Design a protein around this ligand. Structure first.
Ligand SMILES: [Cl-]
Ligand SMILES: [Cl-]
Ligand code: NA
Lengths: 574, 578
């Protein structure tokens, strides 16, 4: 019999677990960390195992402080949920005492950095996006940005940042604290991901390309770009495909966090440093040792010491729930056409081998399933399901060629990849029985598996799915028409034939629909129509139509996760 | 503004569904109690003897046919249509628990009732084209007679068959037939309706007759249709002044056992004489090992088997202390409605709510049914979750006389909604309710939708489960029994079918609505509800909807029970924190 309340307790514990990101070193040699729990963010000083809360009421984020600055700048939503913020200053000697920065009117704060004498940030208002500087003399507009943009770093007078300023690529920009202004350096082939300013006032930047990522040196004075060579070749040899973050430490060495194949690595002046498997945040030097944040499919975001991996600050899950979420791994599954599908697997401690396995299909489709904490995967593992997460073609993270392969072929190659994952799970010995579950494009993939690969999965969960492309091409807004057009090669024939609503007759397995009742980007009407067909043709289905369905709170979990875990737990007994 | 306590709610809901519940069906085999029980997460059939039960069935069942005393077998009734209520019958020999034979001579149909004599199975069923009375024996399956609407076999003695029928105007007639020659005979009272029947050693039919505001016992000679009052040797029964008769039957020693009731509590009589029984309601009475055994329930006591007069349980489920305290108390208040009619309304006060506090008007289904001092899993759940529960017997309700029951005929979503609305107002003006919600299943669901369309601003929010949405489309998709029933209820008027369907007044809804519906309900089907969803969306109304797979009206497993009840409680708890 299904242990409904046992599942609800677990989901609640996975939703509440505190998660940490590392922001910097501030005050008297103390770590600045931000903790989130259930959509509630706070900021702390951390030293020697205890933490002191800096803020009063919950915040949205903090700006990045320079090493040793005696204060922290809090960003807070100005109304319950609003998308406009206010800034507050807390002196690190006097935690919990907040001073509103009254010079800065409400606006959308996008990023920020605090040198200790000047707060430099970007912000979006009724009529524009601007880079701003705030100091003891007042607020100044440094520059109008031609789009959303973010401050990456300040050193002396030079400001560096990243902007979405056109071409669908991310550009580098610089400005100055003194005169303002804006120079923009274009990516060309690729897209810039990160930037820090070198002691020599050059901008070091991560350039993401169609293939391998690299570090470049940009001279703001003449716009010249050259490849930067590091003294150690660990970094070059790693062959990174992304560059998460980079920054110069106080002693002048360059710290870089770079990724490949769903996990990241930490380098100092090119030399790799041992780190726990998964993904890392920024790296700081603190009392002579390295510290970074770490997350994985089995570890909620936490602060750790390198190279030991020992956690400094970590949220507490109960012993038994912790045991249920076992290790994660990367396997490369062979799709029907020979292609190798990078697939992450989170094993359940509460399931045998072979055991019940869910193929949890990510959405997007232009997104990546990496080795990072995911509530849904964890909840499935908690509930006694092994979890298989395939980076079907269309995914990001594995080169442009792999992303572009979905184009013109929805419910084709990518479905074969999902299918190959299922089949690998069975053949490798992981799975006794298979389920499929996903949201957004994942939901679409669930409907395509159940109609075009009936008898592969024992049951499916489809959330926030698209059901008929042709209908949506006609209903929706300009940016979404464009997506559908790209995806289907502008073919109405493909639009109809890759729509699952046109194949309801083929479904042989129980289907659970979870769907928002008021979100104009996955509208309800088409889904009512599917339900009408399912009903007319005598299909087994469950449906949950709820208003106001993102997942951060328990309320959100209850609306869109719980029904899927319950349904699946219940089919497991079928 | 606190956060909803989801984990605490599901745990309470789970335990309240999971408590074992029993009902008494007969004495079979070598003096063993047949009981149908919800236990181990489903509805099953058990023999009780020697302080142990033996499970007769394998897969969950829906009910069993009434055995004659001592018969060497049980006939299981099971839905073989994933909830659409096409049932099939399965024989289990009582010496061989766990082994079923399907009675393949009976094609699936809606089984409404049945009696097993040991040599013949007599039952009533509804197909798409009719209700009928059947007999299955050594010679095969026989249609003894067609019935005009819902009909139920009550007893058989020798070849005399006796039963009750809803054959017009919401009245219940008595009917007889003959096991060998078949045929039908219908007996109507111009005074009221027959409520249960048993055949005397004499081959006359003793029945309850519920009149305007009182009930009595009558004898009906099946040879000439003459009716006369039955006097019993003891007058406790006549002095009890029952307003309704729950059940009656002749025991094997010739004595007449009668369970009758008033104001939502029942009392047990043997040959007219009171037998002490625990306060609440009772089911049939049987003779087991020399003594009397009945079932017993109350708003704080889940259905159990007790022996009489001691009232000591033979089988019962236990609730834990925390949950028992979640019910502070219960009482019957009489609410003045729109025409001066006094509406009997049960109130269950939560031990987890203040006064005034959050209150749910929980509208019973039927509509020929009642809120009484009987266990209600939904009411218990709501009290656990911190709502007081108000349970008004609107006109149409059983239990308070034929006049009150029949006033709903021809007037659905009329006077009975005013009664619900008067109960809502009472909850407020009396000081019980800080805020009001409405919730109901089946006809009660219909009432939620009618309150929300016709009486916007009365309730803060509504939960409509297994609800009626459109009488027209429902009628077209109904089998013979339900078509007849709908005709009766709407007074045969298509105008009423239309004007009293919520689907045609969606625009008026101003409050949030939770819809819960089992996909295969074959009484109130999903299709019209999908159309309501479409109308709610087109007109920008807030709602949520939950459609439960492979289930129908009758919930017979823990899982389905959780899926239909839990969204209700979660919804209402979320609404409370607006
Ligand atoms: Cl300036
Ligand atoms: Cl320039
Ligand atoms: Na400048």
């Amino acid at each position: 019999p299904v242990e409904f309340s046992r599942i609800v307790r677990d989901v609640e514990r996975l939703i509440a677990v505190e998660k940490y990101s590392l922001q910097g070193v501030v005050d008297g040699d103390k770590l600045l960390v931000v903790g989130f729990s259930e959509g509630s963010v706070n900021a702390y000083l951390y030293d020697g195992g205890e933490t002191v809360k800096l803020n009063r009421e919950p915040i949205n984020s903090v700006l990045d402080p320079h090493y040793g600055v005696g204060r922290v700048i809090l960003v807070r939503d100005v109304s319950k949920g609003a998308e406009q913020h206010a800034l507050f200053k807390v002196n690190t000697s006097r935690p919990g005492e907040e001073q509103r920065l009254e010079a800065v009117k409400p606006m959308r704060i996008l990023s920020g950095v605090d040198t200790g004498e000047a707060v430099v940030f970007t912000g979006a208002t009724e009529d524009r996006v601007a880079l701003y500087a705030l100091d003891g003399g007042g607020l100044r507009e440094l520059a109008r940005l031609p789009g959303f943009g973010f401050v990456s770093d300040i050193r002396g007078d030079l400001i560096a940042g990243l902007g979405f300023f056109g071409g669908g690529r991310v550009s580098l920009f610089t400005s100055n604290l003194s005169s303002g202004g804006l120079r923009v350096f274009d990516s060309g082939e690729g897209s810039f991901s990160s930037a820090s300013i070198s002691p020599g006032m050059k901008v070091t930047a991560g350039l993401e390309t169609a293939r391998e990522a690299r570090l470049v040196t940009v001279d703001p004075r003449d716009g010249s770009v050259e490849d930067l060579e590091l003294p150690s070749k660990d970094f070059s040899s790693y062959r990174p495909t992304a560059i998460t973050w980079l920054g110069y430490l106080p002693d002048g060495r360059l710290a870089v966090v770079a990724r490949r194949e769903g996990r990241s690595a930490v380098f100092i002046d090119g030399e790799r440093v041992e780190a726990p498997q998964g993904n890392h945040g920024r790296v700081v030097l603190w009392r002579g040792k390295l510290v970074t944040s770490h997350t994985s499919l089995s570890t909620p975001p936490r602060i750790v010491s390198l190279p030991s991996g020992e956690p400094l600050l970590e949220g507490g899950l109960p012993e038994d729930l912790r045991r249920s979420i076992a290790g994660s791994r990367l396997v490369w599954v062979e799709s029907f056409d020979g292609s190798r599908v990078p697939t992450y697997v989170l094993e359940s401690g509460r399931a045998p081998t072979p055991g019940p396995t869910v193929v949890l299909v990510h959405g997007g489709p232009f997104a990546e399933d990496s080795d990072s904490w995911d509530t849904f995967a964890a909840s499935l593992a908690a509930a006694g399901f092994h979890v298989v997460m395939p980076n079907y073609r269309g995914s990001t993270g594995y080169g442009e060629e792999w992303r572009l392969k979905i184009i013109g072929d929805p419910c084709g190659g990518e479905l074969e990849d999902v299918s190959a994952a299922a089949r690998w799970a069975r053949e490798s010995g992981l799975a006794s029985e298979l389920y499929i579950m996903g949201y957004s494009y994942g939901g679409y993939m669930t409907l395509c598996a159940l109609t075009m690969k009936p008898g592969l999965f024992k049951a499916g969960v489809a959330g926030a799915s698209v059901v008929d492309w042709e209908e949506m091409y006609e209903l929706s807004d300009a940016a979404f028409r464009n997506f559908i057009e790209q995806l289907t090669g502008g073919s109405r024939e493909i639009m109809r034939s890759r729509s699952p609503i046109n194949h309801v007759d083929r479904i042989k397995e129980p289907l659970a629909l979870i769907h928002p009742q008021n979100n104009s980007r996955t509208p309800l009407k088409p889904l009512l129509r599917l339900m009408g067909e399912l009903l007319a043709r005598g299909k087994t289905f469950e449906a949950h139509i709820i208003p106001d369905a993102a997942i951060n709170t328990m309320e959100d979990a209850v609306k869109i996760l719980l029904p899927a875990v319950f349904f699946l737990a219940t089919q497991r007994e079928r």
